[PDB]
Amino acid sequence: FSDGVTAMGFQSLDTQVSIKDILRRPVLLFNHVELDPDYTGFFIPIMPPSRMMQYKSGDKETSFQRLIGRTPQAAIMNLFRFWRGSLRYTIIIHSTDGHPIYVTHVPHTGNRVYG
Amino acid sequence: FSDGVTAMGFQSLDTQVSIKDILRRPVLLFNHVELDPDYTGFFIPIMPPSRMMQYKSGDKETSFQRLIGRTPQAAIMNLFRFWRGSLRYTIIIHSTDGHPIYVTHVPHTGNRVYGLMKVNNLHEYTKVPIFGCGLTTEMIIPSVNPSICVEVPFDTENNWAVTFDEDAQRNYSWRDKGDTVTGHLVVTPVVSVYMSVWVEAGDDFEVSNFYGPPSVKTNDWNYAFSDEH
Amino acid sequence: DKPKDVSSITIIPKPRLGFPHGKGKSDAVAMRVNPVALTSFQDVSAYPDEPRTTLDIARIWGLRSTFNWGSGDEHGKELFNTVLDPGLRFYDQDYEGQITPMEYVTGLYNFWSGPIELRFDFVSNAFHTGTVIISAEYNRSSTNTDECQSHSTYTKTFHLGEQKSVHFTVPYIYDTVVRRNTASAYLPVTDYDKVDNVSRAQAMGIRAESKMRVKVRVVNVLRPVASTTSTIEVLVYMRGGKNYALHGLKQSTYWPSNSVVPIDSFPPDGYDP
Amino acid sequence: FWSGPIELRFDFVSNAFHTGTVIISAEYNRSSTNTDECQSHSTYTKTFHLGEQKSVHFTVPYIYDTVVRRNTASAYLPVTDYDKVDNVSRAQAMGIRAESKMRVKVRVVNVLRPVASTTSTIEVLVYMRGGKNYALHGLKQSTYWPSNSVVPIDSFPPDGYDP
Amino acid sequence: DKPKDVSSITIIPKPRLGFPHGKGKSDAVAMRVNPVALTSFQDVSAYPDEPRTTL
Amino acid sequence: GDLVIASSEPTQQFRSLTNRWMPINSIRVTVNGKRNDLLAQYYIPEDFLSTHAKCAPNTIPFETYVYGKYELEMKFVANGNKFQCGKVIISVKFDSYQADNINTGFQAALSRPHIMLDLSTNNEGVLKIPFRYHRAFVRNQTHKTATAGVRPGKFASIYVQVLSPLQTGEGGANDMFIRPFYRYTRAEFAGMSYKVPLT
Amino acid sequence: GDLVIASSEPTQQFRSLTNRWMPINSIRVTVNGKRNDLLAQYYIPEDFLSTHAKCAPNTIPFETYVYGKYELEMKFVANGNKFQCGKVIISVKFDSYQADNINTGFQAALSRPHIMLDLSTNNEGVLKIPFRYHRAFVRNQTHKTATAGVRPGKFASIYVQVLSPLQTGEGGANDMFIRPFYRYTRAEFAGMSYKVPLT
Amino acid sequence: DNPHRFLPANVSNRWNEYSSAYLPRV
């Protein structure tokens, strides 16, 4: 039978088939979480979302977003195990006040924590 | 008799005779409406204003603006049934606070809803937000800039979208029911807060399938004096 | 190295860009992957017969009115008589019908100008015959008994015979370069509220009515054969001229009342039986 | 959204001493009755003669009313913990499952007549992939999601890691 | 690709522009369709006997 | 554009079967008709399948195929004596599904592409009716095993209306008739399948 | 030669509807068969109309037209295991009306154009069957208002016979099947008329 | 209920639209 003509670029010139372009679209990690000044501060592990961050029915309730597993980005990262390069985080404060919030990088030490 | 000379460009060089340029001027959809964080969020159907959104005397009071039918844009959209291309919405928050409001696009699914609504009748949406599912999103911050101008794309299977139907509430075949929209826009708050939504055409927009003027009614004579006392 | 940035400028912050303006520049944010990606019209595009302007909508022929003409109707009798306003059909009563496209789309603009064409088609055979006239009166109306006053104004006589149609151009002569619309630019009264002089006192504008009139009279009476009908009907078509103009977008005069129902959420709202 | 042809490769788990004829049918706009083979013969078919070659390539075409078909499964499902679903919950779905009545059927043309020395009942592998002109559009929430050996993370090593 | 925007400048925010100044530049927003459209004086214009200055 | 992409297989034309003319049942035009009253209305090509012209050779290919594009012409013939007078307008409306109640006026008929028949001169009228539907193809036939989501056989509506009522003389004929014809100018068919009876 | 003269109007082809293959009901080939015994016999194109392949798209044009010329091909498929052996011959006989009883032997099958199927190797066979009838055209359909002087739908007969009986080994399959296919290579149609159900 | 859900049987078809056979709806 005939292979026919493709439909790529018929509707619009917005192609989303690339792997990296899927991975470059942002995902919500933590939704409306508290910061306590009593402690050192909130820790975020530098890793892309995957089946690691996947919520299960009737497990221990973490501070993570539940549908992270069902996001496209985590679905792509469940096909590849290796990754290299920088990552970009977008942080939003729920305040208008003058008191600043310092974001400090930590390089690879060995431990693996969050919260 | 003589055809004479035209008066186009006599007063000023502001010509407003173009169809698209009328459609590109924005229209108020929702005026000072509440956002409830208990629900998933406010839903907006991706469609231009028309006789669908027309208010009637003594019907059920919707959250829509009443004079949408009497706007020029809806009047032009009551001449054409087909339309294709992106649309632009301008959303305004009635707040100064830091708590952001996430606006998330939904492509053509099939359903056709509006207003504040629960998805699948749950009783919790904070742990499982719609804006962190995977869909395309952009956030508003009232403390920086409480307005926004998003451009919803034309992501559907149809060569043209249906503007209007002969009856809005008729329970006909469900697959053809969904051709009134090209999906939805989702507004998700943090706390209970007011907003307003505006609609206008994108740069890439087109209308076709011309029907002409339907049956109308007026009574504007009654609400004005003549110039003879 | 880490040198300082000495460059600076004064800025005025604004909430939106091109919000009033229909064209120019936009502050739009694309909900796409590629921000420069637009909707394609390479395969499916506009049809060439379709109008690009609202004036081209005003160049479509629409039936303004009809009127009957009989053998009993003597010479000098006003067959037709109206105020040719593209704004309103009536100044004195409710309207409810199928308005012409040019009056429909003129109902959107505050200002109009240019000539307005009328095409009179006659619903007859080749055995109806009789002479009628087309009068255009400015600054004054004529008495219905006095045909001679109407003959002085801008007229065009037609001899009914084989050709059962006549084209006519209503000119545009007034004190002003452009005329404004008679109907209001904003009416917030929606639910047919009982209106008094107090409510009329706080109108958004004043109905600047026109005393221009279009009349058609009998020159020579319709003398048909007995074999055919005595009382025929006349179609009065109407559209804007080729130099017709519109300006100043405002709220629509007319609005649909035939088969209008408000929407509801599909399908939570009792759609599933 | 998806579009374009979808290829099927049928591999037959047999020897060179199995033989018999089968057909590949692609039906649009309507299904055929299971008793009536003749209705299926009218549709877009490809007959294969089983012999030495124990495989056949096939291209399922793409003919529908639309240029692109949309996905049947929902674009957003916030129900995670297997909640008991009623018509009220189904009433407030994010989309409607626009199902397809397209069907792929394989029938017996001539019956498998093997030698007695080999097996009578063989097995068929049905492989599948997108065509070379396959297309996708409109990113949404994933339909499928892993359920095999999933455990949530915890802070290493404060959370009882040191024995 | 999605590269970062390294360019930046220091800015001083002001409420209005050319508010004291009779000439120079303006921060005006046209209530028109075409933002560059101005009122025509092609047919009807000033009379030549009329004064341009207060002197 | 949408033809080649939406259909993997190439579409077929049947010029011998399609391009020929075909009459339907007549239209009675009385003096009892008022303005904006329907003489006739048709949902093409369904009313050329089920009701009118069942056993036409034009309706041969519509059994087997399940998709197609349709550009038609429709010649109408009026026949009244010279001692009558009346005006009949016939317009077309593209993708008229759930839009028959509204924009159904003689005004909308004038606005949309139309033909204007006089009943004294006995002129003919030709409606070039192209394919303008909100999909690539229209579904041809309903079926008891098919889905109930898509309404087939309706991509356009014909509207035959009184523009101005028929008038006659003394002791004249109280009515006259109009015979509609039709033919297919571009009929492309996709999705070959087993044949069925037409509705 | 006889085409253009006998038909004032030009004949039409429907290559999309005609040139495609079409199966029919199968043929059981047993070990119980003797020499010169019929597996199958067909009166083309009547047995492709009435009995086998009623609702085929190949049978779409045969409703409306009343005359035609017919050049066919018929591919037969045999499928038996390698521990069997047998010979099946299939021949054609042009204008076989009132000539089915005589020249029906396997000898006549060898003499007439034929195909020779082995049931072990599982070969296929292609019968190029041209149009050789004692008139210009063959009549397509019978009708209750038509004349009873001419017998329609029979310009040739197919004959599927045992050439040598099927033999099998110890505990082998007692039978094997043959599936006949057919298609139209040159199908010209004259005399357009109103459609009818096929027999 | 809502009376606008279904067109009544007299003037409707199986697809719940106005019948093309029915003229006097106008």
GROMACS .gro file of N, CA and C in nm, chain F residues 41-137:
model
  291
  876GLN      N    1  -3.635   2.187   0.104
  876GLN     CA    2  -3.504   2.191   0.167
  876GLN      C    3  -3.443   2.050   0.162
  877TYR      N    4  -3.312   2.042   0.138
  877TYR     CA    5  -3.240   1.917   0.115
  877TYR      C    6  -3.109   1.916   0.194
  878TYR      N    7  -3.077   1.801   0.255
  878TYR     CA    8  -2.949   1.774   0.322
  878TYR      C    9  -2.864   1.684   0.232
  879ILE      N   10  -2.784   1.746   0.144
  879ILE     CA   11  -2.706   1.674   0.043
  879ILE      C   12  -2.585   1.607   0.110
  880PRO      N   13  -2.538   1.488   0.064
  880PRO     CA   14  -2.607   1.407  -0.037
  880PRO      C   15  -2.710   1.305   0.014
  881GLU      N   16  -2.759   1.320   0.138
  881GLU     CA   17  -2.847   1.221   0.204
  881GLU      C   18  -2.985   1.218   0.138
  882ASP      N   19  -3.037   1.334   0.098
  882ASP     CA   20  -3.170   1.344   0.035
  882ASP      C   21  -3.162   1.310  -0.115
  883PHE      N   22  -3.041   1.290  -0.169
  883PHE     CA   23  -3.019   1.227  -0.300
  883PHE      C   24  -2.991   1.076  -0.286
  884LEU      N   25  -2.984   1.025  -0.162
  884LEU     CA   26  -2.960   0.883  -0.131
  884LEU      C   27  -3.091   0.815  -0.090
  885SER      N   28  -3.149   0.861   0.021
  885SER     CA   29  -3.255   0.790   0.093
  885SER      C   30  -3.393   0.813   0.029
  886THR      N   31  -3.432   0.940   0.016
  886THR     CA   32  -3.569   0.978  -0.022
  886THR      C   33  -3.580   0.986  -0.175
  887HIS      N   34  -3.511   1.084  -0.235
  887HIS     CA   35  -3.520   1.114  -0.379
  887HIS      C   36  -3.404   1.045  -0.453
  888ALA      N   37  -3.437   0.985  -0.569
  888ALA     CA   38  -3.341   0.920  -0.659
  888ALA      C   39  -3.263   0.810  -0.585
  889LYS      N   40  -3.336   0.705  -0.544
  889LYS     CA   41  -3.278   0.588  -0.476
  889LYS      C   42  -3.202   0.502  -0.577
  890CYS      N   43  -3.271   0.465  -0.686
  890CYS     CA   44  -3.221   0.373  -0.789
  890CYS      C   45  -3.163   0.449  -0.909
  891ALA      N   46  -3.098   0.563  -0.883
  891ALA     CA   47  -3.024   0.638  -0.984
  891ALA      C   48  -2.886   0.574  -1.002
  892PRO      N   49  -2.827   0.578  -1.124
  892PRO     CA   50  -2.690   0.530  -1.144
  892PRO      C   51  -2.582   0.620  -1.080
  893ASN      N   52  -2.618   0.745  -1.050
  893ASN     CA   53  -2.535   0.839  -0.974
  893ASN      C   54  -2.511   0.787  -0.831
  894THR      N   55  -2.606   0.710  -0.777
  894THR     CA   56  -2.600   0.655  -0.640
  894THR      C   57  -2.536   0.515  -0.637
  895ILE      N   58  -2.463   0.476  -0.742
  895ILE     CA   59  -2.398   0.343  -0.749
  895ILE      C   60  -2.274   0.341  -0.660
  896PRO      N   61  -2.177   0.436  -0.672
  896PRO     CA   62  -2.056   0.432  -0.590
  896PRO      C   63  -2.072   0.456  -0.438
  897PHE      N   64  -2.188   0.509  -0.395
  897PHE     CA   65  -2.211   0.549  -0.255
  897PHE      C   66  -2.239   0.429  -0.164
  898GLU      N   67  -2.258   0.309  -0.222
  898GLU     CA   68  -2.276   0.186  -0.145
  898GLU      C   69  -2.144   0.146  -0.076
  899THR      N   70  -2.035   0.147  -0.153
  899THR     CA   71  -1.910   0.075  -0.118
  899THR      C   72  -1.813   0.166  -0.042
  900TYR      N   73  -1.803   0.294  -0.081
  900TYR     CA   74  -1.708   0.390  -0.020
  900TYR      C   75  -1.771   0.456   0.104
  901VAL      N   76  -1.685   0.492   0.201
  901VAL     CA   77  -1.727   0.545   0.333
  901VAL      C   78  -1.680   0.690   0.354
  902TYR      N   79  -1.603   0.747   0.260
  902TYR     CA   80  -1.561   0.888   0.264
  902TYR      C   81  -1.562   0.946   0.123
  903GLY      N   82  -1.576   1.079   0.112
  903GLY     CA   83  -1.566   1.145  -0.017
  903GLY      C   84  -1.581   1.296  -0.010
  904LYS      N   85  -1.535   1.363  -0.116
  904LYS     CA   86  -1.551   1.507  -0.141
  904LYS      C   87  -1.646   1.527  -0.259
  905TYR      N   88  -1.727   1.634  -0.254
  905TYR     CA   89  -1.845   1.649  -0.339
  905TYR      C   90  -1.862   1.795  -0.384
  906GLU      N   91  -1.832   1.821  -0.512
  906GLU     CA   92  -1.866   1.947  -0.579
  906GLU      C   93  -1.979   1.918  -0.679
  907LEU      N   94  -2.094   1.985  -0.659
  907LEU     CA   95  -2.216   1.960  -0.736
  907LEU      C   96  -2.252   2.084  -0.820
  908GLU      N   97  -2.343   2.062  -0.916
  908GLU     CA   98  -2.421   2.166  -0.982
  908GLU      C   99  -2.568   2.124  -0.977
  909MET      N  100  -2.659   2.222  -0.960
  909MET     CA  101  -2.803   2.196  -0.949
  909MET      C  102  -2.880   2.295  -1.038
  910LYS      N  103  -2.929   2.244  -1.152
  910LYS     CA  104  -3.009   2.320  -1.248
  910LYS      C  105  -3.158   2.305  -1.212
  911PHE      N  106  -3.225   2.418  -1.190
  911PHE     CA  107  -3.369   2.425  -1.161
  911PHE      C  108  -3.442   2.482  -1.283
  912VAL      N  109  -3.561   2.427  -1.312
  912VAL     CA  110  -3.643   2.465  -1.428
  912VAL      C  111  -3.781   2.510  -1.378
  913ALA      N  112  -3.818   2.635  -1.410
  913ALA     CA  113  -3.950   2.691  -1.382
  913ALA      C  114  -4.033   2.694  -1.511
  914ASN      N  115  -4.163   2.666  -1.499
  914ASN     CA  116  -4.258   2.664  -1.612
  914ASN      C  117  -4.395   2.716  -1.567
  915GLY      N  118  -4.418   2.846  -1.590
  915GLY     CA  119  -4.548   2.912  -1.575
  915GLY      C  120  -4.582   2.997  -1.696
  916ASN      N  121  -4.712   3.021  -1.718
  916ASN     CA  122  -4.762   3.099  -1.832
  916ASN      C  123  -4.726   3.247  -1.812
  917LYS      N  124  -4.742   3.325  -1.920
  917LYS     CA  125  -4.698   3.465  -1.926
  917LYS      C  126  -4.795   3.559  -1.852
  918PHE      N  127  -4.911   3.507  -1.807
  918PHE     CA  128  -5.011   3.585  -1.731
  918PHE      C  129  -4.998   3.561  -1.580
  919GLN      N  130  -4.879   3.521  -1.533
  919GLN     CA  131  -4.846   3.509  -1.391
  919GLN      C  132  -4.722   3.594  -1.361
  920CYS      N  133  -4.690   3.607  -1.232
  920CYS     CA  134  -4.568   3.674  -1.186
  920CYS      C  135  -4.537   3.633  -1.041
  921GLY      N  136  -4.410   3.604  -1.015
  921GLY     CA  137  -4.362   3.560  -0.884
  921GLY      C  138  -4.211   3.543  -0.883
  922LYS      N  139  -4.152   3.548  -0.763
  922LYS     CA  140  -4.007   3.538  -0.743
  922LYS      C  141  -3.978   3.426  -0.643
  923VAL      N  142  -3.890   3.333  -0.685
  923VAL     CA  143  -3.843   3.222  -0.603
  923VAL      C  144  -3.690   3.232  -0.596
  924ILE      N  145  -3.636   3.229  -0.474
  924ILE     CA  146  -3.492   3.232  -0.447
  924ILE      C  147  -3.450   3.094  -0.394
  925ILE      N  148  -3.334   3.046  -0.440
  925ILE     CA  149  -3.273   2.924  -0.390
  925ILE      C  150  -3.126   2.953  -0.358
  926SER      N  151  -3.088   2.930  -0.232
  926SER     CA  152  -2.952   2.949  -0.181
  926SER      C  153  -2.897   2.815  -0.129
  927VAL      N  154  -2.768   2.817  -0.095
  927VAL     CA  155  -2.697   2.704  -0.034
  927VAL      C  156  -2.632   2.752   0.097
  928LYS      N  157  -2.613   2.659   0.191
  928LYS     CA  158  -2.552   2.685   0.321
  928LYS      C  159  -2.457   2.570   0.356
  929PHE      N  160  -2.327   2.600   0.365
  929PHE     CA  161  -2.223   2.500   0.386
  929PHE      C  162  -2.215   2.461   0.535
  930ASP      N  163  -2.200   2.331   0.560
  930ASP     CA  164  -2.193   2.270   0.694
  930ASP      C  165  -2.309   2.324   0.779
  931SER      N  166  -2.430   2.282   0.743
  931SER     CA  167  -2.555   2.334   0.799
  931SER      C  168  -2.606   2.248   0.916
  932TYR      N  169  -2.527   2.149   0.960
  932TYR     CA  170  -2.565   2.062   1.071
  932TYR      C  171  -2.576   2.146   1.199
  933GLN      N  172  -2.692   2.136   1.265
  933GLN     CA  173  -2.729   2.214   1.384
  933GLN      C  174  -2.718   2.364   1.353
  934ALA      N  175  -2.766   2.406   1.235
  934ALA     CA  176  -2.772   2.547   1.195
  934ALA      C  177  -2.883   2.572   1.092
  935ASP      N  178  -2.992   2.494   1.099
  935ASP     CA  179  -3.103   2.502   1.004
  935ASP      C  180  -3.210   2.601   1.053
  936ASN      N  181  -3.221   2.617   1.186
  936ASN     CA  182  -3.320   2.705   1.248
  936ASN      C  183  -3.284   2.853   1.224
  937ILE      N  184  -3.153   2.884   1.225
  937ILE     CA  185  -3.102   3.022   1.221
  937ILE      C  186  -3.032   3.048   1.087
  938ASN      N  187  -3.029   3.176   1.048
  938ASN     CA  188  -2.981   3.224   0.917
  938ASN      C  189  -3.056   3.151   0.804
  939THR      N  190  -3.186   3.127   0.826
  939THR     CA  191  -3.273   3.053   0.735
  939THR      C  192  -3.363   3.149   0.655
  940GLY      N  193  -3.349   3.280   0.679
  940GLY     CA  194  -3.432   3.382   0.616
  940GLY      C  195  -3.395   3.402   0.470
  941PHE      N  196  -3.487   3.466   0.396
  941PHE     CA  197  -3.466   3.508   0.257
  941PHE      C  198  -3.352   3.610   0.248
  942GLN      N  199  -3.331   3.686   0.356
  942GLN     CA  200  -3.220   3.781   0.368
  942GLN      C  201  -3.086   3.704   0.368
  943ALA      N  202  -3.079   3.597   0.447
  943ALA     CA  203  -2.962   3.509   0.452
  943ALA      C  204  -2.944   3.436   0.318
  944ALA      N  205  -3.056   3.405   0.252
  944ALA     CA  206  -3.057   3.344   0.118
  944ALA      C  207  -2.994   3.440   0.015
  945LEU      N  208  -3.026   3.569   0.024
  945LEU     CA  209  -2.966   3.672  -0.062
  945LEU      C  210  -2.815   3.684  -0.033
  946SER      N  211  -2.779   3.682   0.096
  946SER     CA  212  -2.641   3.699   0.142
  946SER      C  213  -2.553   3.582   0.096
  947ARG      N  214  -2.601   3.459   0.117
  947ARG     CA  215  -2.532   3.337   0.074
  947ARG      C  216  -2.541   3.325  -0.079
  948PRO      N  217  -2.450   3.250  -0.146
  948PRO     CA  218  -2.461   3.226  -0.290
  948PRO      C  219  -2.594   3.161  -0.330
  949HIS      N  220  -2.660   3.217  -0.432
  949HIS     CA  221  -2.799   3.183  -0.464
  949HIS      C  222  -2.828   3.200  -0.614
  950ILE      N  223  -2.950   3.159  -0.652
  950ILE     CA  224  -3.008   3.181  -0.784
  950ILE      C  225  -3.148   3.241  -0.765
  951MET      N  226  -3.190   3.324  -0.861
  951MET     CA  227  -3.315   3.400  -0.854
  951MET      C  228  -3.402   3.366  -0.976
  952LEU      N  229  -3.508   3.288  -0.952
  952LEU     CA  230  -3.598   3.236  -1.056
  952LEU      C  231  -3.723   3.324  -1.065
  953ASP      N  232  -3.748   3.378  -1.185
  953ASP     CA  233  -3.876   3.438  -1.222
  953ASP      C  234  -3.965   3.326  -1.279
  954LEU      N  235  -4.096   3.335  -1.250
  954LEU     CA  236  -4.193   3.230  -1.281
  954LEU      C  237  -4.274   3.264  -1.407
  955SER      N  238  -4.249   3.380  -1.468
  955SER     CA  239  -4.315   3.425  -1.592
  955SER      C  240  -4.225   3.401  -1.714
  956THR      N  241  -4.098   3.442  -1.703
  956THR     CA  242  -3.998   3.428  -1.811
  956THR      C  243  -3.956   3.281  -1.827
  957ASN      N  244  -3.969   3.203  -1.719
  957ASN     CA  245  -3.941   3.058  -1.716
  957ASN      C  246  -3.791   3.035  -1.740
  958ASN      N  247  -3.709   3.105  -1.662
  958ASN     CA  248  -3.563   3.094  -1.667
  958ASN      C  249  -3.520   2.969  -1.590
  959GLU      N  250  -3.393   2.929  -1.611
  959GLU     CA  251  -3.328   2.820  -1.539
  959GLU      C  252  -3.219   2.878  -1.448
  960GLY      N  253  -3.178   2.799  -1.348
  960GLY     CA  254  -3.080   2.842  -1.247
  960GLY      C  255  -2.980   2.732  -1.214
  961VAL      N  256  -2.852   2.769  -1.206
  961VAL     CA  257  -2.738   2.677  -1.188
  961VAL      C  258  -2.666   2.713  -1.058
  962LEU      N  259  -2.672   2.622  -0.959
  962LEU     CA  260  -2.601   2.637  -0.831
  962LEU      C  261  -2.474   2.552  -0.832
  963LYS      N  262  -2.360   2.617  -0.857
  963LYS     CA  263  -2.228   2.557  -0.836
  963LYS      C  264  -2.204   2.548  -0.684
  964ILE      N  265  -2.211   2.425  -0.631
  964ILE     CA  266  -2.206   2.397  -0.487
  964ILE      C  267  -2.076   2.323  -0.457
  965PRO      N  268  -1.967   2.393  -0.417
  965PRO     CA  269  -1.841   2.327  -0.381
  965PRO      C  270  -1.846   2.257  -0.244
  966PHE      N  271  -1.735   2.194  -0.207
  966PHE     CA  272  -1.721   2.121  -0.081
  966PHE      C  273  -1.652   2.210   0.023
  967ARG      N  274  -1.728   2.251   0.125
  967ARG     CA  275  -1.679   2.329   0.239
  967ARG      C  276  -1.735   2.268   0.368
  968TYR      N  277  -1.657   2.176   0.427
  968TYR     CA  278  -1.693   2.106   0.551
  968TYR      C  279  -1.577   2.119   0.650
  969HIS      N  280  -1.608   2.105   0.779
  969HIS     CA  281  -1.513   2.129   0.890
  969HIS      C  282  -1.421   2.008   0.916
  970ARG      N  283  -1.417   1.912   0.823
  970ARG     CA  284  -1.322   1.799   0.824
  970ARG      C  285  -1.263   1.785   0.683
  971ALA      N  286  -1.175   1.685   0.666
  971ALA     CA  287  -1.120   1.649   0.535
  971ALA      C  288  -1.228   1.583   0.448
  972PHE      N  289  -1.302   1.488   0.506
  972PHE     CA  290  -1.407   1.414   0.437
  972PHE      C  291  -1.538   1.417   0.517
   0.00000   0.00000   0.00000
